[PDB]
Design a protein around this ligand. Structure first.
Ligand SMILES: *Cc1ccc(CC(=O)NCc2ccc(-n3c(-c4cccnc4N)nc4ccc(-c5ccccc5)nc43)cc2)c(F)c1O
Ligand SMILES: [Cl-]
Ligand SMILES: [Zn+2]
Lengths: 388, 113
């Protein structure tokens, strides 16, 4: 059992629309801090909501009595901002959150301290890398393409301000996710060195080819489903960032989902607007099903050569996403249409993959009939396109 | 809370010394304990560890000559050091896994052979 430690109403800062919305938050002793559109009445917790290893800031801008939960999630620093009516309310909340997180560090350290099996033993610096290209900036860091001097190999390096936080063994065993190769700290930075595939950007391949056949999109979609299934069920994590720009190919033509993002909240949104799920736009409560929406948008784009929702005005784009039904090119087949309609259900509870079975729902869809999912995971499907 | 080493000093090669680590505010029963040493120019070296089960392991340079033991009662770990060679000269530290990964160390105790 997981018990509620503190609960109540808070104003949640919005990223895309309303800016400040009232939500009913539960802080639980497993570390989850989750907001709901109304007092829930009653799925497995997602680590995205954990307050474990957070740092807590009080602040008076842009609103008196606001507090921030800042957390490092894998290689990305995220910040969750809230506001209450009184400075007293805020002290109750920050105190409860701290107490929960403290109790998690304590029980964990005690457990590892007890289970250490002559792992009581006691690799790199900035200088070993050549800068080549800025890949992106965020509020607390930057991502750059680097060449490792000693080997000639290319990596993406994520460089974070160390002070806002204060792993390579924790790497996921999945072929199509971005593996962390090194992690190191300087005097003022924490840097993550991660793989960089050299088969090109799928965004660029799709642009040049105009559209992918249903069979080519089925191959890429299967590799993506396999990776998201792993994240969801082995890591208890949602990706939240699936867009075409975040798909690359390796030299053999297999997919790599990239981990190059940084939050931009605090010095143009974070998520690319055309890929955002309705419940993310509305800061409604969200779960594993947000990734299946992203899969829908990306496979719509591969098989149709254009987005399912677009407008240069992002408020009209948001309204398309929330309100308009999808139309399909006249040449798309019914298995593809069935998959895409299912993935792009606006209600996460009705969306394909949104039930307790998660990715299994999608793996069983008739669009994927004949895919051997064990072969997908082992890179035994032969790629329809080999990059140069 | 804190770990504190004692029992070091000057000693002639082939001699013996017993190091102790008084754990004040921690519980050595609940944790893998290990001994370490570090020489002026070198990095810190794992020497020995005792599991909560009592199982011991040792690194090669010391296997046979040192023995690490845990006294649950006195909340202390020990390193019995036997037949000391010059290359044993160093400052010796005891530690838990958690403190180890956070680079938190007691004051250490100097052994000179
Ligand atoms: C507004 C906002 C909100 C959240 C975030 C963070 C975010 O969306 N980042 C995207 C992201 C999520 C998860 C992971 N991730 C990977 C991974 C994904 C794809 C490709 N390669 C990899 N390696 N692997 C992970 C392991 C563990 C975790 C994790 C741990 C604890 C808590 C949450 C997640 N995440 C993993 C990578 C990227 C925002 F950026 C913004 O802007
Ligand atoms: Cl590659
Ligand atoms: Zn963000």
């Amino acid at each position: 059992d997981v018990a509620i430690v503190k609960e109540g109403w808070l104003h949640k800062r919005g990223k895309y629309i309303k800016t400040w919305r009232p939500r009913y938050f539960l802080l639980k002793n497993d570390g989850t801090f989750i907001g709901y559109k109304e007092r829930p009445q009653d799925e497995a917790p997602l680590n995205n909501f954990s307050v474990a290893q957070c740092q807590l800031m009080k602040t008076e801008r842009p609103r008196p009595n606001t507090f921030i939960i800042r957390c490092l999630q894998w290689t990305t620093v995220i910040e969750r901002t809230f506001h209450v009516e009184t400075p007293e309310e805020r002290e109750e909340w920050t105190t409860a959150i701290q107490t929960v997180a403290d109790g998690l560090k304590k029980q964990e350290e005690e457990e590892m301290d007890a289970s250490a099996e002559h792992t009581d033993m006691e690799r790199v610096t900035m200088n070993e890398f050549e800068y080549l290209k800025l890949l992106g900036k965020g509020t607390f860091g930057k991502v750059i393409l680097v060449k490792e001097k000693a080997t000639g190999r290319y990596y993406a390096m994520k460089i974070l301000k160390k002070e806002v936080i204060v792993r390579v063994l924790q790497n996921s065993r999945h072929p199509f996710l971005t593996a962390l190769k090194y992690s190191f700290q300087t005097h003022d930075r924490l840097c993550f060195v991660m793989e960089y595939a050299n088969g090109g950007e799928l965004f660029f391949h799709l642009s040049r080819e105009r559209v992918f056949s249903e069979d080519r999109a089925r191959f890429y979609g299967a590799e993506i489903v396999s990776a998201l299934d792993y994240l969801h069920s082995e890591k208890n994590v949602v990706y939240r960032d699936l867009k075409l720009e975040n798909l690359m190919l390796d030299k053999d033509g297999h997919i790599k989902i990239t981990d190059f993002g940084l939050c931009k909240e605090g010095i143009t949104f974070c998520g690319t607007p055309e890929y955002l799920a309705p419940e993310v736009l509305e800061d409604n409560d969200y779960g594993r099903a947000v990734d299946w929406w992203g899969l829908g948008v990306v496979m719509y784009e591969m098989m149709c050569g254009r987005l399912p929702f677009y407008n240069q005005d992002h408020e009209k784009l948001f309204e398309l996403i929330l309100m308009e039904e999808i139309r399909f090119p006249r040449t798309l087949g019914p298995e593809a249409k069935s998959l895409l309609s299912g993935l792009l259900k606006k209600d996460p509870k009705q969306r394909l993959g949104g039930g307790s079975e998660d990715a299994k729902e999608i793996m069983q869809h008739r669009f994927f009939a004949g895919i051997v999912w064990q072969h997908v995971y082992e890179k035994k499907l032969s790629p329809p396109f080999k990059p140069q | 809370v804190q770990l504190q080493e004692s029992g070091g000093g000057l000693v002639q090669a082939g001699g013996s010394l017993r190091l102790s680590c008084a754990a004040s505010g921690i519980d050595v029963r609940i944790k893998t304990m290990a001994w370490y040493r570090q020489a002026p120019g070198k990095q810190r070296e794992l020497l020995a560890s005792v599991l909560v089960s009592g199982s011991t392991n040792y690194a090669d340079p010391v296997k046979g000559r040192f023995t690490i033991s845990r006294d649950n009662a006195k909340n202390t770990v020990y390193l019995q050091m036997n037949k000391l060679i010059p290359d044993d000269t160093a400052v010796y530290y005891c530690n838990t896994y958690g403190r180890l990964r956070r680079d938190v160390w007691g004051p250490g105790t100097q052994v000179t052979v």
